[model samples]
Target chain A: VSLWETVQKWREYRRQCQRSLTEDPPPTDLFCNRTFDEYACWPDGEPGSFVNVSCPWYLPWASSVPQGHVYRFCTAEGLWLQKDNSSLPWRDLSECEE
Target chain B: XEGXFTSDLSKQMEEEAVRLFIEWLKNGGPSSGAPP
Candidate 1:
């Protein structure tokens, strides 16, 4: 029940991110698009920059409250950084894990 | 058996929930104030 509730909270946060993006759309020419990576909601980011977000609650081993932030990188080409041979983007969760 | 089964079931449900949430995000969830 608690895990389910956490998922619902994440869903609501994803909605908020989408709403904010829609309300103030970012430039397509020089920024990575906003997205929810199932773990965290990321806003538009400048090329060659990293976006940070608070750790999510649903991580089974994570603290009940947020410990710190996680980050994901945006490429210089205005795209989220993806691993070679994979379409899925990469996120750095080390801070959250510690 | 009962404890393991319950744990497995919840694990599966959690994975499925995350998958569905990812799908919803890909579909631009609630961007227009309606379900995606």
Candidate 2:
């Protein structure tokens, strides 16, 4: 996807999160802070399954911008999904690629 | 993938790459790791 498209999706994700917070107020005092941590949670739960693979097919723009990948995972918008989840809930989210 | 499953896809890509690289070397280029 083009850079504009990628960023627009991110904008939409943030807008959706705000809409959720505004309509369905969170009961916990932790508020957004707690959910913030989940945003970085790697969907790939297996410890080094990610690292063990050979050098990845670094996305076209990745190397020039620095090390990164465009691989799909919903962490950016799906972190709120974890707020109601268990510490190691991934065991049951069995399809998570890793 | 939890194991080598993800890598299985790359193996075919790498093999195809090796094949092309070998063809290129035969057409005259610096020696790459491709078996002659």
Candidate 3:
């Protein structure tokens, strides 16, 4: 159809893909790059950019200090770092020592 | 900012963040009461 219409469709598709990473409902109240709260998932793909998120409760492990939260960092290379030395991208940076 | 003080400050902030994170985790995390 028209170029304007095509651009709109592509933007819509990109948003859907970004939200597709999480199975939980895409949080409607979340403001990307501005507000990140616990229990919410936001898209990240920039270095020096990170989300402060809590760990899953049923992970069968405990942090060095009982239970802990951690930063989910989007590294310099556009990769998510749940923890260091791993690319699974969601293991929790706060060491699950249990 | 490449001195011991700078490094120490960074370490301290890191430590604090982790400490808070631990507290949050112990409190049942973000999705604690959300519908599973």
Candidate 4:
């Protein structure tokens, strides 16, 4: 099925993202570092700003829904935004859904 | 079915993660430092 092909594409994308994390140059002052959040890879972001990326192909509903983006925020302290009670960084995936 | 599709996808993703982790280990781990 075509869905299998989509899975392969997502795997390829994931591989590239993982490789890039080490290969890419470091960021400048006051910027969040590039990272792969399992679902998506994000580039360096300016402090106190948001970074948006297209919905990933791996999501089950991704092919059925209109194109949308997922975003993550970088705090003013130059770190990825974290949940109130956890160390894990926070990302907004609601936009990726219908 | 959507459930079947999701299960299959999850299995594949897990395999890919294991493969990548093995590759990372072969490269001497993070303490070896990233390549230039």
Q: Which model scores highest in lDDT? A: 4
Compared with the true structure, what per-residue lDDT tens digits does model 2 show for residues A1-98? 23344334434544554565456534422211211112111222222222111112212222443433322222433332233634322212112212
Better of 2 and 3 by lDDT: 3
lDDT of model 4 at position A59 = 57
RMSD to the true structure for each prediction, in A, is 6.5, 18.4, 18.9, 9.0
Best by DockQ: 1
In model 4, which runs have C-alpha deviations exceeding 4 angstroms?
A1-7, B1-36
Indicate whether candidate 1 or candidate 4 has the larger DockQ: 1
Error of model 3, residue A96, in angstroms: 3.5
Error of 2 at A11 (Å): 0.2
- Docking level for model 1: incorrect
Clashes found in each candidate (C-alpha, N, C closer than 3 A): 0, 2, 2, 0
Interface RMSD of each: 5.3, 18.9, 16.7, 9.6
Mind giving the per-residue lDDT tens digits that candidate 3 earns over A1-98? 23344334434543454455544344323233322233223454456466654443333233334546555666565555545653234535544443
Cα lDDT of model 1 by residue, A1-98, tens digit:
35466567766766776687688755656889887655577888889988887776555445753667878899999889987965458877667642
Say which candidate scores most in TM-score. 1
List runs of model 1 lying over 4 Å from the truth. A25-28, A57-67, B1-36
Per-prediction TM-score, chain B alone = 0.64, 0.52, 0.61, 0.63
DockQ scores of the candidates = 0.13, 0.02, 0.06, 0.05
Weakest 10 consecutive residues of candidate 1 chain B by summed lDDT: B27-36
Clashing pairs in 4: none
Evaluate candidate 3 and give its CAPRI docking class based on DockQ: incorrect
At residue A2, what lDDT does model 2 achieve?
39
